[PDB]
Amino acid sequence: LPEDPKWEFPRDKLTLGKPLQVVMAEAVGIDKDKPKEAVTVAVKMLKDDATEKDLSDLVSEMEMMKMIGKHKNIINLLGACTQDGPLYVIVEYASKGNLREYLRARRPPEEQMTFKDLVSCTYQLARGMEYLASQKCIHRDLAARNVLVTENNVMRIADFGLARDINNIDYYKKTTNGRLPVKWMAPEALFDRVYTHQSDVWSFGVLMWEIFTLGGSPYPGIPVEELFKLLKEGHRMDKPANCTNELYMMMRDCWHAVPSQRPTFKQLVEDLDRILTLTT
Amino acid sequence: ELPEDPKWEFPRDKLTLGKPLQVVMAEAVGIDKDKPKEAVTVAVKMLKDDATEKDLSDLVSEMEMMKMIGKHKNIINLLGACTQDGPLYVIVEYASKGNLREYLRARRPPEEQMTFKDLVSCTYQLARGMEYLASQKCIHRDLAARNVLVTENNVMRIADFGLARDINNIDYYKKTTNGRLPVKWMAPEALFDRVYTHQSDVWSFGVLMWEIFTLGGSPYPGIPVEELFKLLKEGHRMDKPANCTNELYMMMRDCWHAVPSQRPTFKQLVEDLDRILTLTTN
C-alpha cells in the first residue's frame, strides 16, 4: 500500500471504541489546527473474516473519497492509517445515525418530521449528489440506509464502497453492476450493463420514496426476483401518503425508463430549491 | 427465468415461514415423501430485500451444488426448493443446536462443557464430512466453525456451500480466483497461485481444528488479515491451543504445510482421528 503523507494519520493518536465494519473512535489532533484536541471520528476497517476482495474494496472506497472533494452534504475523509498495520479509513462522525433509521424513528406514534423537513432533507441530498455528479463520480449505491445525519440534522451521503469515476466502468461486460441492491438500481445498469449519472438519479428517486414514507421499504411485497420484469412492464411505486403530487411527479421523473429523459441533479436541485422556499 | 426440477420442487403452499435463524425456520408439510401429512421443521434460505444480482446467482449456485453432493451423515442436506412463480426458496435440513462456532463458545468453562472426546469426535466427524465431500470432486472453499451446524444429537454437518465449486469449476491463474474467501482460513496457494484443490480444504480444515480445540477461538488473534500472509510465507502458525495434546497440534501444523501435497489427505485425517478418538475411549 503506497505511502500517502497527505492523508496518513498517526496510529498512536487514534483510539478505537464502541462499534457503529465501522467503529467510533477518538482521533487526537486529526484537526490540523487543533493539534491537541481529540476529535470523535468514525473508523472503517476490515473484519476478522475479511476476504481479499473486501480489502481491495476498502482501499478503493478510501481512494474514491480522496478524489471526491469536500461538500456539506457528503461525509468527508479525515485521514487513514495505511502503513504497518490494519487499514483504517477515518471519516467524519455522524451522531444521529443513518437516514433510514432516523426516519423510521420519528414516525408519528422521536420528534416527528414535518413536510418542510422531508423536502429540506431531500433538497440537501440533491445538492450533495449534484456535487458528486460534477466530480464525475457515480455512487451506484444510493439509498436511505447509506445516508448519515450529523448532529445538526444535516444530510451526508455515505458509503462509497461501490462508487466509481464515470469512465471506470466495464461497459457491456456481464459482471457489471452485479453488486448493486436491485430495488434501488436503474434498469439500464442491468439490461445494458452501463452506469451513468442518470442511473444515480433513478436511485435518487427511490431514495425520495423512502424519505417521504419515513423509512418505507421499496416495492413492498415484491421479491427482487420478480421486480425487473415488472419494472420492464412499466411498474412504478405509488404516491406515498404525506407527499405532494408535485414531488411524486418528481419521483416518477427520476424513474423515466429512458435515462436521458430523467432529470439531472442540477435540475433536481433547482426544482427542490424552489419547492422548499415556497413551503417556507 | 429458472428451469424446473420437478424432483426437488416443493409446493410453495405447503411451506410455512417463521422466525429467522438470509435464513429462516419453517414448517414443510409432507416434505418427506414417506409421511405426506407430517409437518417437518426445516430451514429456508432466501434473498434479502436489499439483495443484488450476485446474491441471487449465488443462492441459485449454492442450491445446485447441494443437488450434486450426495447424502451424507456429516453434511447439511437439501430438502427441496420453491423456484417457480415467487421468491427463490432453498429448503434445507434444520439443525437445532445452530452453528458450531457459537455452540462451542457457549459451553466454555465458567450449556454443558465439552469433554476432550467430544472435541475429537467433532473433529473426526467433520473429517468424514470433508473426506466424502472430496470423494465427490467437490471443494468447499469456505470451511470454518461458523459454517458447521450441529443437530439435536450433536452430529456435525458441514453447511454453507455458497462458495463450493466442482473440482474443475475454478479458473486456475486468474487474478480474480478465490478473492471472496475469508483470508484467515484460506490456503496460501488459493491466493498466491490462484488455484484451489482438496489440499486447500485440508489447510482450511486445520484452522477449523484450531477453532474446535479453542472452543470457538478466533484464528490468528491480534493479527490483521492485511499482514497475515506475509507472516505465513514467513512461517508463522498459530500456537498449540490450551488443553490440546501435542499429537492433535502436530496434526493441525501438518494441515498448514506450505506445500499442498505435504498436507494430509482427508482420508488420512479421518484414520488418525479415528485412532485418537478410539484410544481415548480406552
Coordinates of C-alpha atoms in Angstrom, one line a residue:
Chain A
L1 CA 0.0 0.0 0.0
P2 CA 1.6 3.3 -1.2
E3 CA 2.5 6.0 1.3
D4 CA 0.2 9.0 1.1
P5 CA 1.7 11.6 3.5
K6 CA -1.2 13.9 2.8
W7 CA -3.8 11.6 4.3
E8 CA -1.8 9.4 6.7
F9 CA -2.7 9.7 10.4
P10 CA -0.5 8.6 13.3
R11 CA -1.9 5.3 14.8
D12 CA -0.9 6.2 18.3
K13 CA -3.2 9.3 18.2
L14 CA -6.2 7.1 17.2
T15 CA -8.3 5.4 19.9
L16 CA -10.8 2.9 18.7
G17 CA -14.1 2.3 20.5
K18 CA -17.6 1.0 20.6
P19 CA -18.8 -0.3 17.2
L20 CA -21.3 1.7 15.0
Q21 CA -17.0 -2.8 9.8
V22 CA -17.2 0.6 11.4
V23 CA -16.3 1.8 14.9
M24 CA -16.4 5.1 16.8
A25 CA -13.0 6.4 17.6
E26 CA -11.1 9.2 19.3
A27 CA -8.6 10.9 16.9
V28 CA -6.2 13.3 18.6
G29 CA -5.1 16.3 16.6
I30 CA -6.8 14.9 13.5
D31 CA -7.7 18.6 13.0
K32 CA -4.5 20.2 11.7
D33 CA -5.4 23.4 13.5
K34 CA -6.2 21.9 17.0
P35 CA -3.1 19.6 17.4
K36 CA -4.1 18.7 21.0
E37 CA -7.8 18.3 20.7
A38 CA -9.2 14.7 20.4
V39 CA -12.0 14.5 17.8
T40 CA -14.6 11.8 17.9
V41 CA -14.5 10.2 14.4
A42 CA -15.7 7.0 12.8
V43 CA -13.2 4.4 11.6
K44 CA -13.9 1.8 8.9
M45 CA -11.6 -1.2 8.8
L46 CA -11.8 -4.8 7.6
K47 CA -13.4 -7.7 9.6
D48 CA -11.7 -10.7 11.1
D49 CA -13.3 -12.8 8.4
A50 CA -12.4 -10.3 5.6
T51 CA -11.7 -11.6 2.1
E52 CA -9.2 -10.3 -0.4
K53 CA -12.0 -8.5 -2.3
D54 CA -13.1 -6.8 1.0
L55 CA -9.7 -5.2 1.3
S56 CA -9.5 -4.2 -2.4
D57 CA -12.9 -2.7 -1.8
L58 CA -11.9 -0.9 1.3
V59 CA -8.8 0.5 -0.3
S60 CA -11.0 1.7 -3.3
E61 CA -13.5 3.3 -1.0
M62 CA -10.8 5.4 0.5
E63 CA -9.1 6.4 -2.7
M64 CA -12.5 7.3 -4.0
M65 CA -13.2 9.7 -1.1
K66 CA -9.7 11.2 -1.7
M67 CA -10.8 12.1 -5.2
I68 CA -14.2 13.4 -4.3
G69 CA -13.8 16.9 -2.8
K70 CA -15.5 18.4 0.2
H71 CA -19.2 19.3 0.5
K72 CA -21.6 20.0 3.2
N73 CA -23.8 17.0 2.2
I74 CA -21.3 14.2 1.8
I75 CA -19.4 12.6 4.6
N76 CA -15.7 13.6 4.2
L77 CA -12.5 11.7 4.6
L78 CA -10.4 12.8 7.7
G79 CA -7.4 10.6 7.1
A80 CA -6.2 7.0 7.1
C81 CA -3.7 4.7 8.7
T82 CA -2.2 2.7 5.8
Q83 CA 1.3 1.6 6.7
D84 CA 2.4 -1.0 9.2
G85 CA -0.9 -2.3 10.5
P86 CA -4.6 -2.8 9.6
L87 CA -6.1 -0.4 7.1
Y88 CA -8.0 2.3 8.9
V89 CA -10.2 4.8 6.9
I90 CA -11.0 7.7 9.2
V91 CA -14.2 9.5 8.3
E92 CA -16.3 12.3 9.9
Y93 CA -18.7 11.0 12.6
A94 CA -22.5 11.4 12.1
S95 CA -24.1 11.5 15.5
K96 CA -27.8 10.9 14.6
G97 CA -27.1 7.7 12.7
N98 CA -28.3 6.8 9.2
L99 CA -31.3 8.3 7.5
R100 CA -33.5 5.2 7.1
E101 CA -33.2 4.5 10.9
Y102 CA -33.5 8.2 11.8
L103 CA -36.8 8.5 9.8
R104 CA -38.5 5.3 11.0
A105 CA -37.5 6.7 14.4
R106 CA -39.7 9.9 14.4
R107 CA -42.6 8.2 12.7
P108 CA -45.9 9.5 14.3
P109 CA -46.8 7.3 17.3
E110 CA -38.8 10.7 18.5
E111 CA -39.8 14.2 17.4
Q112 CA -41.9 13.7 14.3
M113 CA -40.7 15.1 10.9
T114 CA -42.6 17.9 9.2
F115 CA -43.2 18.3 5.5
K116 CA -40.6 21.1 5.2
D117 CA -38.1 18.8 6.9
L118 CA -38.6 16.0 4.3
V119 CA -38.3 18.5 1.5
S120 CA -35.2 20.0 3.1
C121 CA -33.7 16.6 3.7
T122 CA -34.5 15.8 0.1
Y123 CA -33.1 19.1 -1.2
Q124 CA -29.9 18.7 0.8
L125 CA -29.2 15.2 -0.7
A126 CA -29.9 16.5 -4.2
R127 CA -27.2 19.1 -3.8
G128 CA -24.9 16.5 -2.3
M129 CA -25.5 14.3 -5.4
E130 CA -25.2 17.2 -7.8
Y131 CA -21.8 17.9 -6.4
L132 CA -20.8 14.3 -6.7
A133 CA -22.0 14.2 -10.3
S134 CA -19.9 17.3 -11.0
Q135 CA -16.9 15.4 -9.6
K136 CA -17.6 12.9 -12.3
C137 CA -18.3 10.2 -9.7
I138 CA -21.1 7.7 -9.7
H139 CA -22.3 6.4 -6.3
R140 CA -24.1 3.3 -7.5
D141 CA -25.4 2.5 -4.0
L142 CA -27.7 5.4 -3.2
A143 CA -30.4 4.7 -0.6
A144 CA -31.7 5.9 2.8
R145 CA -29.6 3.3 4.7
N146 CA -26.5 4.9 3.2
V147 CA -27.2 8.4 4.3
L148 CA -25.9 9.6 7.6
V149 CA -27.3 12.5 9.6
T150 CA -25.0 14.8 11.6
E151 CA -25.9 16.3 14.9
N152 CA -27.2 19.3 13.2
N153 CA -29.6 17.1 11.3
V154 CA -27.6 17.6 8.1
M155 CA -27.7 15.1 5.3
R156 CA -24.4 13.5 4.5
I157 CA -24.2 10.9 1.6
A158 CA -22.1 8.0 2.8
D159 CA -20.9 4.5 1.7
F160 CA -18.6 4.9 -1.3
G161 CA -17.6 1.3 -1.4
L162 CA -19.2 0.9 -4.9
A163 CA -18.7 4.4 -6.3
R164 CA -16.6 4.8 -9.4
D165 CA -15.3 7.5 -11.7
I166 CA -17.7 7.8 -14.7
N167 CA -15.1 6.4 -17.0
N168 CA -14.0 3.5 -14.8
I169 CA -16.9 1.2 -15.7
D170 CA -16.8 -2.0 -17.8
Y171 CA -19.4 -1.1 -20.3
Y172 CA -21.4 -4.1 -21.6
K173 CA -19.5 -6.7 -19.6
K174 CA -21.7 -9.4 -18.0
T175 CA -20.3 -8.8 -14.5
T176 CA -21.0 -5.1 -14.4
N177 CA -23.4 -3.7 -11.7
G178 CA -23.9 -7.1 -10.1
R179 CA -23.4 -6.0 -6.5
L180 CA -26.0 -3.2 -6.6
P181 CA -29.1 -3.7 -4.5
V182 CA -31.7 -4.5 -7.2
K183 CA -34.5 -2.4 -5.7
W184 CA -32.5 0.9 -5.9
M185 CA -30.9 0.0 -9.2
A186 CA -31.6 1.6 -12.5
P187 CA -32.9 -0.8 -15.2
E188 CA -30.1 0.0 -17.7
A189 CA -27.5 -0.8 -15.0
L190 CA -28.6 -4.4 -15.6
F191 CA -30.3 -4.5 -19.0
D192 CA -27.3 -2.8 -20.6
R193 CA -24.5 -3.2 -18.1
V194 CA -23.8 0.5 -18.0
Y195 CA -23.9 3.2 -15.3
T196 CA -24.2 6.9 -15.7
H197 CA -25.2 9.9 -13.6
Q198 CA -28.8 9.3 -14.9
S199 CA -28.6 5.9 -13.2
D200 CA -27.9 7.7 -9.9
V201 CA -30.9 9.9 -10.3
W202 CA -33.1 6.8 -10.8
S203 CA -31.7 5.6 -7.4
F204 CA -32.2 9.1 -6.0
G205 CA -35.9 8.7 -6.9
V206 CA -36.1 5.6 -4.8
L207 CA -34.4 7.5 -2.0
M208 CA -37.2 10.1 -2.2
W209 CA -39.8 7.5 -1.9
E210 CA -38.0 6.3 1.3
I211 CA -37.7 9.8 2.7
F212 CA -41.4 10.5 2.2
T213 CA -42.5 7.2 3.6
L214 CA -40.4 7.9 6.6
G215 CA -38.2 4.8 6.0
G216 CA -40.5 2.7 3.9
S217 CA -39.3 -0.5 2.2
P218 CA -39.3 0.0 -1.6
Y219 CA -41.5 -2.2 -3.8
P220 CA -43.3 -3.7 -0.7
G221 CA -44.4 -7.3 -1.2
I222 CA -42.5 -7.7 -4.4
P223 CA -39.5 -10.1 -4.3
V224 CA -36.4 -8.8 -6.1
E225 CA -36.6 -12.0 -8.2
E226 CA -39.7 -10.7 -9.9
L227 CA -39.0 -6.9 -9.8
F228 CA -37.2 -6.2 -13.0
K229 CA -39.8 -7.9 -15.1
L230 CA -42.4 -5.6 -13.5
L231 CA -40.1 -2.6 -14.0
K232 CA -39.8 -3.5 -17.7
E233 CA -43.5 -3.9 -17.9
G234 CA -43.9 -0.3 -16.5
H235 CA -44.4 -0.9 -12.8
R236 CA -43.6 2.1 -10.5
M237 CA -44.3 2.7 -6.8
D238 CA -47.4 4.7 -5.8
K239 CA -47.5 8.2 -4.4
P240 CA -46.6 7.9 -0.8
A241 CA -49.2 9.4 1.6
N242 CA -47.9 12.6 3.1
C243 CA -46.4 13.6 -0.2
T244 CA -47.1 16.4 -2.7
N245 CA -48.4 15.3 -6.2
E246 CA -45.6 17.6 -7.5
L247 CA -43.0 15.7 -5.6
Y248 CA -44.4 12.3 -6.6
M249 CA -44.2 13.5 -10.1
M250 CA -40.6 14.2 -9.5
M251 CA -40.1 10.7 -8.2
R252 CA -41.8 9.4 -11.3
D253 CA -39.5 11.5 -13.4
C254 CA -36.4 10.1 -11.8
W255 CA -37.9 6.7 -12.8
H256 CA -38.3 7.5 -16.5
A257 CA -37.4 4.4 -18.5
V258 CA -35.2 6.4 -20.9
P259 CA -32.1 7.7 -19.0
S260 CA -31.7 10.9 -20.9
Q261 CA -35.4 11.6 -20.1
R262 CA -34.8 11.6 -16.4
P263 CA -33.9 14.9 -14.9
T264 CA -30.4 15.7 -14.0
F265 CA -29.3 16.6 -10.4
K266 CA -28.7 20.2 -11.4
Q267 CA -32.4 20.3 -12.4
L268 CA -33.5 18.4 -9.3
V269 CA -31.6 20.9 -7.2
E270 CA -33.4 23.9 -8.7
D271 CA -36.8 22.3 -8.6
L272 CA -36.3 21.2 -5.0
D273 CA -34.8 24.6 -4.1
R274 CA -37.9 26.2 -5.5
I275 CA -40.5 23.9 -3.8
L276 CA -38.6 24.3 -0.5
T277 CA -38.6 28.1 -0.5
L278 CA -42.3 28.1 -1.2
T279 CA -43.0 25.6 1.6
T280 CA -41.4 28.4 3.7
Chain B
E1 CA -36.2 -17.4 -15.8
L2 CA -35.4 -20.5 -13.7
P3 CA -35.5 -24.1 -15.2
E4 CA -37.8 -26.5 -13.4
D5 CA -36.5 -29.5 -11.4
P6 CA -39.7 -31.4 -10.6
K7 CA -37.8 -33.9 -8.3
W8 CA -36.6 -31.1 -6.0
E9 CA -39.5 -28.6 -6.4
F10 CA -41.7 -28.2 -3.3
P11 CA -45.4 -26.9 -3.1
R12 CA -45.0 -23.3 -2.1
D13 CA -48.3 -23.6 -0.3
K14 CA -47.1 -26.5 1.9
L15 CA -44.4 -24.3 3.4
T16 CA -45.0 -22.0 6.4
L17 CA -42.2 -19.5 7.0
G18 CA -41.4 -18.3 10.6
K19 CA -38.7 -16.9 12.9
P20 CA -35.2 -16.0 11.4
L21 CA -32.2 -18.1 12.4
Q22 CA -30.9 -14.7 4.8
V23 CA -32.2 -17.9 6.5
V24 CA -35.4 -18.6 8.4
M25 CA -37.1 -21.6 10.2
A26 CA -40.2 -23.1 8.6
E27 CA -42.8 -25.9 8.5
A28 CA -42.6 -28.1 5.4
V29 CA -45.7 -30.1 5.5
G30 CA -45.2 -33.5 3.8
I31 CA -41.8 -32.7 2.6
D32 CA -41.0 -36.3 3.4
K33 CA -42.4 -38.5 0.6
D34 CA -43.0 -41.1 3.3
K35 CA -45.2 -39.1 5.7
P36 CA -47.1 -36.7 3.3
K37 CA -49.2 -35.3 6.2
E38 CA -46.4 -34.6 8.7
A39 CA -45.2 -31.0 9.0
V40 CA -41.4 -31.1 9.2
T41 CA -39.4 -28.3 10.7
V42 CA -36.9 -27.0 8.2
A43 CA -34.7 -24.0 7.4
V44 CA -35.2 -21.8 4.4
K45 CA -32.6 -19.6 2.8
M46 CA -33.8 -16.8 0.6
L47 CA -32.7 -13.4 -0.8
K48 CA -33.0 -10.3 1.5
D49 CA -34.8 -7.2 0.3
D50 CA -31.6 -5.3 -0.5
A51 CA -30.3 -8.3 -2.4
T52 CA -28.2 -7.8 -5.5
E53 CA -27.9 -9.7 -8.8
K54 CA -24.9 -11.6 -7.4
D55 CA -26.7 -12.6 -4.3
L56 CA -29.4 -14.3 -6.4
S57 CA -27.0 -16.1 -8.8
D58 CA -25.1 -17.1 -5.7
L59 CA -28.1 -18.6 -4.0
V60 CA -29.0 -20.5 -7.1
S61 CA -25.5 -21.8 -7.4
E62 CA -25.5 -23.0 -3.8
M63 CA -28.7 -24.9 -4.4
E64 CA -27.3 -26.6 -7.4
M65 CA -24.2 -27.6 -5.6
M66 CA -26.3 -29.2 -2.9
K67 CA -28.1 -31.1 -5.5
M68 CA -24.8 -32.6 -6.9
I69 CA -23.4 -33.5 -3.5
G70 CA -25.0 -36.8 -2.4
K71 CA -26.5 -37.5 1.0
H72 CA -24.1 -37.9 3.9
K73 CA -24.2 -38.1 7.7
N74 CA -21.9 -35.1 8.2
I75 CA -23.3 -32.7 5.6
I76 CA -26.3 -30.4 5.7
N77 CA -28.7 -31.7 3.1
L78 CA -31.2 -30.2 0.6
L79 CA -34.9 -31.0 1.2
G80 CA -36.2 -29.2 -1.9
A81 CA -36.9 -25.7 -3.2
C82 CA -39.6 -23.3 -4.4
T83 CA -38.2 -22.0 -7.6
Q84 CA -41.3 -21.2 -9.8
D85 CA -43.6 -18.2 -9.5
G86 CA -42.3 -16.4 -6.4
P87 CA -39.1 -15.7 -4.5
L88 CA -36.5 -18.5 -4.6
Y89 CA -36.6 -20.6 -1.5
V90 CA -34.0 -23.2 -0.8
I91 CA -35.3 -25.7 1.8
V92 CA -32.5 -27.3 3.8
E93 CA -32.2 -29.6 6.9
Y94 CA -32.8 -27.7 10.2
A95 CA -30.1 -28.1 12.8
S96 CA -31.4 -27.3 16.3
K97 CA -28.1 -26.6 18.1
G98 CA -27.2 -24.0 15.5
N99 CA -23.7 -23.4 14.2
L100 CA -20.5 -24.9 15.8
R101 CA -18.7 -21.6 16.5
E102 CA -21.2 -20.3 18.9
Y103 CA -22.1 -23.8 20.1
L104 CA -18.6 -24.2 21.3
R105 CA -18.1 -20.8 23.0
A106 CA -21.5 -21.5 24.6
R107 CA -20.1 -24.4 26.6
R108 CA -16.9 -22.8 27.7
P109 CA -15.8 -23.5 31.3
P110 CA -17.4 -20.9 33.7
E111 CA -24.7 -25.3 28.4
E112 CA -22.7 -28.4 29.5
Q113 CA -18.9 -28.3 28.9
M114 CA -17.2 -30.3 26.1
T115 CA -15.2 -33.4 27.0
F116 CA -11.9 -34.0 25.2
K117 CA -13.6 -36.8 23.4
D118 CA -16.4 -34.6 22.3
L119 CA -14.0 -32.2 20.7
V120 CA -12.2 -35.2 19.0
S121 CA -15.5 -36.8 17.9
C122 CA -16.5 -33.4 16.5
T123 CA -13.2 -33.2 14.5
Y124 CA -13.4 -36.8 13.4
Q125 CA -16.9 -36.3 12.1
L126 CA -16.1 -33.2 10.1
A127 CA -13.1 -35.0 8.5
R128 CA -15.5 -37.7 7.4
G129 CA -17.7 -35.0 6.1
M130 CA -14.8 -33.4 4.1
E131 CA -13.5 -36.8 3.1
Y132 CA -16.8 -37.5 1.5
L133 CA -17.1 -34.0 0.0
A134 CA -13.7 -34.6 -1.6
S135 CA -14.8 -38.0 -2.8
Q136 CA -17.4 -36.1 -4.9
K137 CA -14.9 -33.9 -6.7
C138 CA -16.3 -31.0 -4.5
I139 CA -14.2 -28.3 -2.9
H140 CA -15.9 -26.4 -0.1
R141 CA -13.6 -23.3 0.0
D142 CA -15.2 -21.7 3.0
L143 CA -14.5 -24.2 5.7
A144 CA -14.8 -22.7 9.2
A145 CA -16.5 -23.3 12.6
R146 CA -19.2 -20.8 11.7
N147 CA -20.0 -22.9 8.6
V148 CA -20.8 -26.1 10.6
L149 CA -24.2 -26.8 12.0
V150 CA -24.9 -29.2 14.9
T151 CA -28.1 -31.3 15.2
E152 CA -30.1 -32.3 18.3
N153 CA -27.9 -35.3 18.8
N154 CA -24.8 -33.3 18.3
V155 CA -24.0 -34.6 14.8
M156 CA -21.7 -32.2 12.9
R157 CA -23.0 -31.1 9.5
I158 CA -20.9 -29.1 7.0
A159 CA -23.0 -26.3 5.7
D160 CA -22.9 -23.1 3.6
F161 CA -22.0 -24.3 0.1
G162 CA -22.4 -20.9 -1.5
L163 CA -18.7 -21.0 -2.5
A164 CA -18.3 -24.7 -3.0
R165 CA -17.2 -25.5 -6.6
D166 CA -16.7 -28.6 -8.6
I167 CA -13.1 -29.5 -8.8
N168 CA -13.0 -28.3 -12.4
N169 CA -15.0 -25.2 -12.0
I170 CA -12.1 -22.9 -10.9
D171 CA -10.1 -20.6 -13.2
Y172 CA -6.6 -21.5 -12.3
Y173 CA -4.3 -18.5 -12.5
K174 CA -6.9 -15.7 -13.0
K175 CA -6.2 -12.7 -10.7
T176 CA -9.9 -12.9 -9.5
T177 CA -9.9 -16.5 -8.5
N178 CA -10.6 -17.2 -4.7
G179 CA -10.8 -13.4 -4.0
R180 CA -14.0 -14.0 -1.9
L181 CA -12.6 -16.5 0.5
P182 CA -12.1 -15.5 4.2
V183 CA -8.4 -14.9 4.5
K184 CA -7.7 -16.3 8.0
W185 CA -9.0 -19.8 6.8
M186 CA -7.7 -19.7 3.3
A187 CA -4.8 -21.7 2.0
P188 CA -1.8 -19.7 0.6
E189 CA -1.9 -21.3 -2.9
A190 CA -5.5 -20.1 -3.1
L191 CA -4.2 -16.5 -3.2
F192 CA -0.6 -16.8 -4.4
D193 CA -1.1 -19.3 -7.2
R194 CA -4.8 -18.6 -7.9
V195 CA -5.8 -22.3 -7.7
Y196 CA -7.8 -24.4 -5.3
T197 CA -7.8 -28.1 -4.6
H198 CA -8.8 -30.6 -1.8
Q199 CA -5.4 -30.0 -0.1
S200 CA -6.5 -26.4 0.0
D201 CA -9.5 -27.6 2.0
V202 CA -7.3 -29.5 4.4
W203 CA -5.4 -26.3 5.2
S204 CA -8.8 -24.8 5.9
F205 CA -9.7 -27.9 7.9
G206 CA -6.7 -27.1 10.1
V207 CA -7.8 -23.7 11.1
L208 CA -11.2 -25.4 11.8
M209 CA -9.4 -27.9 14.1
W210 CA -7.8 -24.9 16.0
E211 CA -11.2 -23.3 16.4
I212 CA -12.6 -26.5 17.8
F213 CA -9.9 -27.0 20.4
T214 CA -10.0 -23.4 21.5
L215 CA -13.8 -23.8 21.8
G216 CA -14.6 -21.3 19.2
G217 CA -11.5 -19.1 19.4
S218 CA -10.7 -16.6 16.7
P219 CA -7.9 -17.5 14.2
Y220 CA -4.6 -15.7 14.4
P221 CA -5.6 -13.4 17.3
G222 CA -4.4 -9.8 17.2
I223 CA -3.1 -10.3 13.6
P224 CA -4.6 -8.1 10.9
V225 CA -5.7 -10.0 7.7
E226 CA -3.6 -7.5 5.8
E227 CA -0.5 -8.7 7.4
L228 CA -1.2 -12.4 7.8
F229 CA 0.0 -13.8 4.5
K230 CA 3.4 -12.1 4.9
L231 CA 3.7 -13.8 8.3
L232 CA 2.6 -17.1 6.8
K233 CA 5.1 -17.1 4.0
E234 CA 7.4 -16.2 6.8
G235 CA 6.5 -19.4 8.5
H236 CA 4.1 -18.1 11.3
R237 CA 1.5 -20.6 12.5
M238 CA -0.9 -20.5 15.4
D239 CA 0.1 -21.9 18.8
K240 CA -1.0 -25.1 20.4
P241 CA -4.4 -24.3 21.8
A242 CA -4.5 -24.8 25.6
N243 CA -5.9 -28.2 26.6
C244 CA -4.8 -29.8 23.3
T245 CA -2.5 -32.8 23.0
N246 CA 0.7 -32.4 21.1
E247 CA -0.5 -35.1 18.7
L248 CA -3.5 -33.1 17.7
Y249 CA -1.5 -29.9 17.5
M250 CA 1.1 -31.6 15.2
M251 CA -1.9 -32.6 13.2
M252 CA -3.0 -29.0 12.8
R253 CA 0.5 -28.0 11.9
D254 CA 0.6 -30.6 9.2
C255 CA -2.5 -29.2 7.5
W256 CA -0.7 -25.9 7.4
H257 CA 2.2 -27.2 5.3
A258 CA 3.4 -24.7 2.8
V259 CA 3.4 -27.4 0.2
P260 CA -0.1 -28.7 -0.6
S261 CA 0.9 -32.3 -1.1
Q262 CA 2.7 -32.5 2.2
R263 CA -0.6 -31.8 4.0
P264 CA -2.5 -34.9 4.9
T265 CA -5.4 -36.1 2.8
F266 CA -8.9 -36.1 4.3
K267 CA -8.8 -39.9 4.3
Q268 CA -5.6 -39.8 6.4
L269 CA -7.0 -37.3 8.8
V270 CA -10.1 -39.5 9.3
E271 CA -8.0 -42.5 10.1
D272 CA -5.7 -40.7 12.6
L273 CA -8.7 -39.1 14.3
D274 CA -10.5 -42.5 14.3
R275 CA -7.4 -43.8 16.1
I276 CA -7.2 -41.0 18.6
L277 CA -10.9 -41.0 19.4
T278 CA -10.9 -44.8 19.9
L279 CA -7.9 -44.9 22.1
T280 CA -9.5 -42.0 24.1
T281 CA -12.5 -44.2 24.9
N282 CA -9.9 -46.5 26.5

